[PDB]
Paper text:
In order to further the structural analysis of the components in Cvt vesicles, we determined the 3D structure of the secondary cargo [name] from [name] using cryo‐EM. After vitrification of the sample, we refined the tetrameric [name] structure to 6.3 Å overall resolution from 33,588 particles (and EV3A). Subsequently, we built a complete pseudo‐atomic model based on a homology model of the mannosidase core combined with two additional N‐terminal domains. For the remaining N‐terminus, we built two domains: a jelly‐roll fold (residues 45–203) and a four‐helix bundle (residues 17–27, 209–271) based on distant homology and the EM density. In contrast to the homologous dimeric S. pyogenes α‐mannosidase 32, [name] [name] forms a tetramer. The transverse interface connecting two monomers perpendicularly to the [name] length axis is formed by the β‐sandwich domain and is located on the opposite side of the dimerization interface described in the homologous mannosidase structure. In addition, we identified an N‐terminal four‐helix bundle domain that comprises the major longitudinal interface bridging two monomers along the [name] length axis within the tetramer. This suggests that the [name] wild‐type tetramer is required for in vitro recognition by the autophagy receptor Atg19.
The earliest discovered selective autophagy pathway in Saccharomyces (S.) cerevisiae is the cytoplasm‐to‐vacuole targeting (Cvt) pathway, through which hydrolytic enzymes are sequestered into double‐membrane vesicles, termed Cvt vesicles, and transported to the vacuole 8, 9. The best‐characterized cargo component of the Cvt vesicle is the vacuolar aminopeptidase I (Ape1) 16. Ape1 is synthesized in the cytosol as a 55‐kDa zymogen that includes an N‐terminal propeptide (hereafter referred to as prApe1), which oligomerizes into a dodecamer 17, 18 and further assembles into larger aggregates in a propeptide‐dependent manner 19.
Numbering used by the authors:
A (entry chain A): 287 to 353
B (entry chain A), C (entry chain A): -12 to 0, 45 to 63, 77 to 178, 193 to 203, 209 to 271, 287 to 678, 702 to 739, 752 to 818, ...
Amino acid sequence: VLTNVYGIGNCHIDTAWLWPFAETRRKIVRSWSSQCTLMDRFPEYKFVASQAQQFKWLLEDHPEFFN
Amino acid sequence: XXXXXXXXXXXXXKRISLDHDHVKVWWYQVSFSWKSIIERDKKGELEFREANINQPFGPSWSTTWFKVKISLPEDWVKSNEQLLFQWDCSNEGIVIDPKTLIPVTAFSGGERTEYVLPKTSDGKHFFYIEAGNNDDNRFFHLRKADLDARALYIDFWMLGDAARELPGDSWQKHQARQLGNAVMNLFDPNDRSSVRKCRELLQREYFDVLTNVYGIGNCHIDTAWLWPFAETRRKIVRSWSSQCTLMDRFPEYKFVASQAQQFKWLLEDHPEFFNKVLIPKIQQSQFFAVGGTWVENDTNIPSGESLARQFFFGQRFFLKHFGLKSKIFWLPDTFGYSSQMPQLCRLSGIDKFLTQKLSWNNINSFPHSTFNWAGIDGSQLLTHMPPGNTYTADSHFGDVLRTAKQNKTPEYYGSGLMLYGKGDGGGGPTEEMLQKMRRIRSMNNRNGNVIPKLQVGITVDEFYDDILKRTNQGHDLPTWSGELYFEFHRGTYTSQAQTKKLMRLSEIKLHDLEWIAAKTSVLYPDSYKYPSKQINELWENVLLCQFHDVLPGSCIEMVYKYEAVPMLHNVVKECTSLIDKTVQFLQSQSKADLVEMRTLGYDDYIVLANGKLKVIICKKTGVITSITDETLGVEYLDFVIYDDKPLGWQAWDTELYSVNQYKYVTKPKKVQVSCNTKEKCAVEVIFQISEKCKIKSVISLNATADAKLSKVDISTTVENWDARNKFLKVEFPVNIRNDFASYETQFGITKRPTHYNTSWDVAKFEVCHHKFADYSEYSKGVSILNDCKYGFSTHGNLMRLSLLRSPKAPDAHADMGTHEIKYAIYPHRGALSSDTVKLAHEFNYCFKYKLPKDIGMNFDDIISISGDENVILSNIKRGEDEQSIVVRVYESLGGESFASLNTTLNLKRIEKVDNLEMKVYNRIPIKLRPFEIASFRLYF
Amino acid sequence: XXXXXXXXXXXXXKRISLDHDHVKVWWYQVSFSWKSIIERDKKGELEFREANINQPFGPSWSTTWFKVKISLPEDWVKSNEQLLFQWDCSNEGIVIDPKTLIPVTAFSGGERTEYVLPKTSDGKHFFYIEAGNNDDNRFFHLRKADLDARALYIDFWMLGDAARELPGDSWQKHQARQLGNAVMNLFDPNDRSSVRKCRELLQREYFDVLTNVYGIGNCHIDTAWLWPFAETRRKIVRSWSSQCTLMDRFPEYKFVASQAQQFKWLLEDHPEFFNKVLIPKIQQSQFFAVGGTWVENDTNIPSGESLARQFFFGQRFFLKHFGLKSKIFWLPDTFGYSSQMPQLCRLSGIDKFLTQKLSWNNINSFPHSTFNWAGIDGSQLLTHMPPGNTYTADSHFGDVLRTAKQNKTPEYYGSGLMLYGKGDGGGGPTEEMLQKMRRIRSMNNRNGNVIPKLQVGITVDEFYDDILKRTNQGHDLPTWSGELYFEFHRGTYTSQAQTKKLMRLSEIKLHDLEWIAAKTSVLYPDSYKYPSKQINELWENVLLCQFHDVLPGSCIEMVYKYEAVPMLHNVVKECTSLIDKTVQFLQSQSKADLVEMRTLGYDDYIVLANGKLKVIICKKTGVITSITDETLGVEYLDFVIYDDKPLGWQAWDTELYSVNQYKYVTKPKKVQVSCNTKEKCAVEVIFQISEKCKIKSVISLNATADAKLSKVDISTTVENWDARNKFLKVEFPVNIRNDFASYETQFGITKRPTHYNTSWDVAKFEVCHHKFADYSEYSKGVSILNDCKYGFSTHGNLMRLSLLRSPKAPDAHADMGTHEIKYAIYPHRGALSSDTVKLAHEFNYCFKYKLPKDIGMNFDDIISISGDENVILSNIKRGEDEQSIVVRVYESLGGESFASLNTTLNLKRIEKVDNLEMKVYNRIPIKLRPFEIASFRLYF
């Protein structure tokens, strides 16, 4: 019986919620860093991002070494 | 949900072709052997005649032969087509295509079946087929063909069937539905090109936790049942032939045979070409003999000698060209199991056992199906137990995944267990499509080992190699002490005691002449003296009626008359002939010889006056009141009260009506006394009931120390009349409180409580026994000796013996006619606690006296220095080929005392030897373990 | 657990006595009336002969009479015993004990049944019984008796049966087990004194939340089914007699009758003594007429006139001595329900309705079984709905508590609903032991009101008094708009269109002459002019074949030939005779009269050239490509593509094979054209398929404004051959996106989506229709007119009409033979959106022309000042007794516009009158509500 069980680790972030945008702007950078340390620790991991603007938020806050 | 759309549509609805040849067809019937009819065929004009049509019949014991002479149609065109001839299966018969006669072909398989015509040789052959009647008319037509088209039809039928069994929540069910969809598309509009193509597309849709699912095709045959032995002797040859044609068609197939005598039956009937058939068949692979046992029987009723011969005389085939065997022991239809079986197995060189019934799935203080059996002897038995689905799970099985799920729950292991073939009938069939079954199951599940792999070709020998690895050797394991208990279907066990009376008397009688006939060895030398070849033939006929179905008396009326025929009778008649024979040239050293085997009053005041005890029946009541010991001080109130309750079930099980009052036999009795003497005292009291019938019991006993004995003898004589479907019993309430019931099983004494296990289902609780049953706190109790009745029950401490039973089964001989019954009631004491056991079992001895002319001295006690009261020697006999003799002993009283064994002999040597009469290098033990069978062998 | 011990024991196992009287018994058979055979009995020696034994037979349409002359045995002894005669029930017949002939007794009840002999009169009587053949041999023996002993046997049988139904967790199950125990005790050993005593002891063991459980014994009879009308006419008299003998035996019993014509059938056959039987029977109590309807029919296919007559002509019995009625409306076997029924019910003075199927239990946006039906008209209908167990729950019911639990779940109310009797057969039986049924159920449950009380004698009239109290008047209630949807079993609905072609043509034809025959009133006075007595007899014969089972064509082959017999035919033949009759003395005022009822090219370049539209079939493809409007701008790609898919189910339901490819009729076609003219254009294109068969459709239409019309006409002529079990359809894919499908129902237009409800089960989705179905976003769409086919389907917006169906049912006339089909495809626009509806329905009109001699002027338009295009007048007719005429109108377009009604007349007055033609004091409405039926009456 051919079957497959898979999954993709993902983070769904609301840009404005019971915590504000300026505060959650610091929250989105914590989502990227958890993957970076995971990459060296474990391979083949998959992450997805529903926000294209999420890139810009990281590029504005950390333009130098994180680009 | 389109559930009935896919499932019931295409399942109902060159390629298959039906041609009819009317001429050349002959029919034959005997209203009055295959070798005898071949000479009666070509000569002149005999009862063989033209049929060409369907032949109706009527009920008869006759068999109807049939001959079909077929000419191969055209040349090439219908040769590529699959040739087949369909027959309607009758009660019994055989099928042959003899030249002159080589072959024997299978018949007894189910009403649907296939007969393949050889495509190798182009020409004309003959067909010989007989049909047993009991009427069943045969439908016979020639069937041509294709193999690829019919394959898809079968594969699809087993597909949609597997779709229903699979869980609807799983995607597999929705998958198999879509698989049943696409197939139906091209299958519907009658296209040969589409069907053959769709079959390929379906295979593409097929192929795209360590466990194993296996099975072994087997046939369980009862040698005597509702069809007789002579007729079923023709039925067993149909079981072998079905395998032979299957071997060339499919490999890796496995067959097992519970009968070692089955070989002899085939060798006697077909000695010429079929003796050379078995050797490549058995030796290479695909065949295994389970247990190497001569008979499959109930082990409760007979002695260990019956279990001794079946192993030894079934091992005789090993001396011939034979002997690929298995360590499994198979008693599927056997009701109940002995507690000495774990001891008997290890000594017989057989380490595994199989049990169908007598188990439950729950926490019982017991884990699962698979079990390691530890007897009360202390020995262990590793046994393989099939699930609650028994042997009928894989029997005639096209359902695939159906019972696969129900098999996994009771069993843990690493793998499950499946038994293919039916165990109910003249013999079990083996289906020819099993090749596709293993293949199509390999179509659904992939290959390589990840998911459970499907292999039907593995042998139990390799299966027992897996259990030695995965599970631990073990200390704490599944543990059940003694026997097992589930619904017994006791039934005929206590019914028709007359066949027991004949057998039990024949049992001891055949067990009588055995050893002492080796004691005359010195007297007149030739081979010296022993009926080696003579007593061997004796055990041949006796074991035939001792089978599990035959012995209790559950069967049709025809073979039941064959039970009371010389088969049982002549054995006693031949043994009573030999006992009067061997005496002539032996006893001549005896002037007057008493021959016994061992090794060292008032009416109105209602009293029989003597010292030992007192037992009194009250006036006009008919019921015994006071049984009381003066020295002991125990007084009884509620004895020997006969009770009659009806029965509303068949022969198999026993089911009483809901809260039905059992009618007492108490009535306006009269008082009488048989004789007058100090030697002989019998007081007579009449009992009667509605639809007047005379129920008589007798009273016999010897006083004390003019008559001498410690035990009463009460024998019952009743001639049954009128009302049927009744069950008669006699009650002996002890009026005492005990949580334990002392009972002597086969070769020992098992310990069973007064109350059945809390997992028990059926209301009525009855126990099968050998001779006596007791209740002992060891300071006192009550002992009950009995004859011809193997049954009894525990009522809350009321002793109840079963006199007779009359089932509603289609047997008219289980209802009426006279019966002679015998039993006893014995006083118990701590000092006599070992005495009651000794005075119980062998009391069946019959006094016999005869004298010759006088020259000699008749007193010799030849036994050498043993003298153990706690031990009892059941059997000592000779060998097969030398004539070395064996000695088997077993300890009567065990569980407390460790018996020191000083047993030995003189002028020769001795070594310990197992139940198979095979040489074993521990030597003679100086001390015997509790509940241990000690068997030895004697050499010159 | 002693489960099979109590249940299966005593249930199987003066008092009942069987005596045999061989002599005096006579038998009779007709291989060629009860009043005709009584004169043929005593005279001479006729075919009446001595039987005295069992009489075998063979298949025939014949009936076999039987005569038993019985003399009462002894005097007193066997008089106290219950006298009984057991008969084996055949297909049909009657039983009589006539002197000379008073009685008529019941037969049609089940194979088991009882016939009581009167103990009041001591003497000798006669028995007349006939057996209908279709063979069934009768077993006839005289049976004497007691009543008390048999009562206990029945009560115990219904006891243990109730024990199994009761929850095992409850103590009641363990109680009833113990109740079944003590009874079996004294019952087993054959004691009459014990049985009669134990029966009393059992009653003592019996007697020691407001809810109600009731039921009404009823018989649902189909006037035409697999047995014919003439034969079932004898079957209906057996339904009445079973009640008559039950009334004296048991009181409070309730019976209901769905047929008002059932009264007339009995009054015609037994006018003398049985006209006086009904009056005390119906008037007092125990009898109720449901709906007062002349016929029980499917309401989808016919018009409202068929529903108008059945109410009115069924209310004619009320004018006789009759009229105890109920407010319930009963259509259990009717498939589907109209949306105008809530409007038709309130006007007919009937406030309740019953529906068997077409419901589900879940949250549907719907609570339960009990329902208040709100039609699309806005009116409300309170209806009583039986559970999912339908009417077969209480049918032949001895099981007591069995279905009592399953009845409580779908229904809330304060109480449940049970319908006693079978609705499948020649007629339903009513059991005579129902007296004990109500009593024994009062034995288990106590009396007084705490727990639910058991009363089978309550009437639905009082039941509707309970619903008015407990539940609120309501605003928000259970609500379902339009019709109901469950598995329809459409089946024969689209099958055998030939019986529809005859009926649908007879439908309009009988609906034709109705009103205009009252327009000649002034011309020649006698009664003036109208076929009052003549057209009344016309509707008598027509409604007979319009029943729910008969009309769709689901039936045996025998009565199917009676459908195409003059029964349907002569109606058209008599109406075409009258239309040529009344014209003679009428049309004589017309020189040349056009009679119609109302109130005010190329081949290779493949074109038929005109202004209105263009429809093109591609070359060699056979499939229409472009249907396109220039002004509108809608282009179509995928029209009129015939599709043939097989069918694997019976006549009842329709089940297609799993994913079976439907064969297209496309083939190497050739091109042709019928005629050449501007008036007439028909282009011919041939289609063929495997096993060659000629499938022909035609093309007809009128151009624009030389020919004038807005709509095409395409008629299909196909003669079926060879392959059966096929289902033919023609597809009209719109290539458009709409979530709504415009369809005109009976008296209005219902609104149904493109997708079936999410609770739908069966894959195939098809809808029954009257004439046309459309898809409209109101700016555009596609309209499809059709004839003789009531079925269609919604494929995802692909219009598919069903041409023919051939079921696998045992009917050989549903397979082969020619058929004439007709339909159409119409262009849709917002302005023509009201036009398409007007050009659809009544297009079935047939042009007819005839002329007499000339004196007069033939132009008169007599209609007075209405002129509403959104309204359509379906029926205007006269009355029964005066000869006042009624006018019924209904609004075609509704749900949006509120139609102002200016409709009135001159020289007379007018008042609003309901569908029952009963006088109603609101007056003529000046404005009509959307989807409202407006009916009025006209007086001099």
